[PDB]
Symmetry: D2
Subunit: 292 residues, 4 copies
């Protein structure tokens, strides 16, 4: 029974979306995107940003790591691993023919694949970031900083995609049946928010119903839970070998400008996100293999 | 009391969307967009593109006029007239603050308006093109060609937006309720298809429901039908004063490579579109006034 | 013999370029651009931006008029006039074959024409705004605000291009022969700066060389000076017909935060730029006819 | 004292630039760019494009390996080795402060770095592809195909940057002093063409003058030559570990539609480009290190 505990939490999640961010926050958002090389600010980071003084500081200490060849490779290796697991554990029926007969052209299918690629690339990076924040607060420990192989400190593979923000059908954008599909995803993944990935997929509603329909039965199966732990374990491994040292303890959260009551709540918010993210990575992988 | 008769169309409408155009047709589509200065190909042009030898020739004869200062003013002046007519004939509520209550941020509402602007600007150009194609086929007459005021033949005000294609939720992207909204629109406006602007509005499903709900009771009221007649009449006036002579008769269709059967079918397709376009212009004006 | 006298100016101009504008200034810059519907901030407004609280206030007072149908038309009508004058007065030979033989492709020439259209469209708007700044300071008068045709107050032709900033070879970017062409232009036009449109033409050095060389002999011919006078006069006539009253006096400048010595300086700077802009409008027109 | 011998090239090179490629060739270019995930078509592939049925055939046989985790990783590792080599062998002074003295602002220098990143990322992909074309022709051999690590056959790190084409100051665009800077590079690098990256730096002529001036003394020092050999041998090694077998021999060229003499010509051409590419990787690495 390889594990992964869904956390003790329903402390309020107050994510600040990019279309509401003031220009101080937007500046940190821009730098995050620019550093990760992704066109979206993840919901994990939106929710941590509510604790803005901790967020700016947490990010300041993690950024030097995130700019490294190490971090690109360790993120990439989680993408590879997710691909490996989901192929071996599940028989994933291709969906292209069904989509074509639903009216979807080859170009449109191409656009759908391109959107999936953004999250297949990005999410591991948010997973590793989520893990440093959680483990740093909970444990007090200083992670990484070894000189080791000097190539691990080199600049990461350079070229991004930062504009535009992907088209996402926010919860308040949603129509009748779309709200039903979001509620389903919410209950099935046991979450109080809808991830960016499904929101971007929901630009093509019928495609999302079909894609989510295929994935849903696989959720929380024994192979699923086991892959989730493997992915969770590798994220913890990347954190243990950050090329630039990273510390951000409860006491660091105080000095950043947070109360102890605020730090506590943050801990429960990040635990939810960190747990969730390993699952989200397997989900996008499945979607991406559907679209083979 | 006046009004525009819906034509008797039983013919089959086969739009070729931009995401299915082959490379030959896509060239024509790009020339059309660049000429008009709009980021999208109209459903009118997509359906006429099915009759491709005719579409390519009719466009070659019409494009010289479309490039003129006259055609920009003539189009602009139909947008102004629609604004005027909908302002006088209709009490129209500002909906911006009801969208705020629904969750819509200031940036999001700005994006919505930007989208309305594209069609408010472009639709008259298509109405005039459609009118030319229809009257040319029915009358066999040569329209325009007067030297007149030399300034009418100058290049049009040159800035434009031609990429990206507006984000449109197509009928096969539609989930449950969005099909219901699309059905409601087709039935209420007497159309076998959904125009581009509604599809673009559909990226925000909840906004569309709201904006369509507020327009719907105005449809085919006396004042609507009177304004619609007036809009139509100006399209016909614009056709009469094209700077470059336009002729495209049933015979010209034959020599372009169409049969007489296909030409007859084309005459009803464009009649349906041309009628429709006067209504669409008022519809977008209403939306745009709602977003005030 | 109509000649537009060049104002005395030995004040120092200090443009704040877009790539150096801080957050605050950049926000004003973006509102400017979105209102004019241009992808670039003019040097005129860059220079005036140095006197920041004046720039901020003057723009707030001018923007309500710039958003209107009237302003779109009055700007556009100066373009038409420039086109008219330059065609009437000069035999302007095409340069397209010369460019083709120089190795320029049809796509490249397309690109060059697009760049020219940007400034053909936008400079009249900057010309009118310069005139309003200059005359409001000099005269203390309140301009416009009359009742008039209600359609003048309608929103302007909506579609815009706000991004990206055109590629411009700044003066610290330039090489040797580009520094010389830049210097010949500064000499001939009697200016201490290179205008945006010359810097954008400059992305193709060998093209600017040719285009500039052909325009140069026309500068300060009698027909050119006469046409420029006419162009200036129409900017003056627009100022009086502004739909929303504009007042920004010597005393408003003081109440905004400026010193007497600053306000004097601003007056010399805005008058050098106001004079310059009628010339620029003609120059772009000549380039654009060259490239037909 | 390792050196990479320069081949003899009697043959005329004939690049088909992206702005002249017809519809057919553009389609291949686009797939090339989509597969490599770079926004530009290398001069190498432009030159081979002249022998079109060969290029189309060599590409279709290479693209299966170019889409793989292996190719991404092998290309990335050549960038890393270049950074490593130049780091150890040279004391490379920052130049950001000199640029900032010349007038360049922080945003601007950011834009320069982004342009350098494109070529840092992309050239190793063109280098390996050039080596496969060369060695295929020279040796008749079949390269790669070994099953090996199954992970090697997974899709590469997904995310792309396909638009827009870098702003490049082509040779027919250049001024007098750029021509001579362009001649200097041709002479010093022993080439009859100007590579894409230098053409992109030339957008900032004063910066290219500076950055090239700083690289020139390092060219053909023993550490450079030695480093260049090493880069070369790593490209040969990548060739043997290709995940999909690649064969494109002299006979295959003949079957494709090339004549004997053309095949002779192609061989010299590809040989010169293959040789150039290892040095070009060093050069870009050096520029990028100057600008850190």
């Amino acid at each position: 029974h390889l594990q992964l505990p869904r956390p003790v939490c329903e402390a309020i999640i107050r994510p600040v979306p990019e279309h509401r961010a003031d220009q101080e926050l937007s500046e940190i958002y821009r730098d995050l995107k620019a550093t990760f090389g992704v066109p979206w600010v993840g919901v994990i980071t939106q929710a941590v940003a509510y604790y803005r003084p901790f967020f700016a500081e947490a990010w300041r200490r993690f950024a030097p790591s995130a700019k490294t060849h190490f971090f690109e490779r360790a993120s990439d290796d989680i993408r590879i691993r997710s691909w490996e697991l989901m192929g071996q554990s599940f028989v994933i029926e291709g969906q292209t023919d069904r989509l074509r007969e639903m009216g979807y052209s080859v170009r449109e299918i191409g656009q759908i694949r391109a959107v999936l690629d953004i999250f297949d690339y990005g999410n591991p990076k948010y997973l590793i970031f989520a893990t440093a924040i959680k483990e740093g607060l909970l444990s007090g420990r200083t992670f990484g900083g070894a000189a080791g192989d000097a190539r691990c400190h080199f600049p990461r593979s350079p070229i991004c995609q930062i504009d535009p923000i992907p088209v996402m059908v926010e919860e308040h954008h949603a129509g009748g049946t779309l709200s039903q599909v979001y509620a389903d995803i919410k209950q099935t993944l046991q979450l109080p928010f809808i991830n960016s990935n499904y929101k971007a997929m929901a630009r093509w509603p019928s495609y999302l119903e079909q894609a989510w329909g295929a994935l849903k039965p696989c959720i929380d199966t024994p192979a699923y839970q086991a892959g989730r732990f493997d992915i969770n374990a590798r994220a913890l491994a990347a954190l243990d070998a950050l090329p630039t040292a990273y510390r951000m303890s409860r006491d660091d959260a105080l000095q950043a400008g947070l109360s102890e009551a605020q730090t506590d709540e943050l801990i429960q918010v990040i635990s939810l996100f960190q747990w969730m993210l390993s699952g989200l990575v397997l989900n996008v992988t499945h979607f991406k293999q559907q679209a083979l």
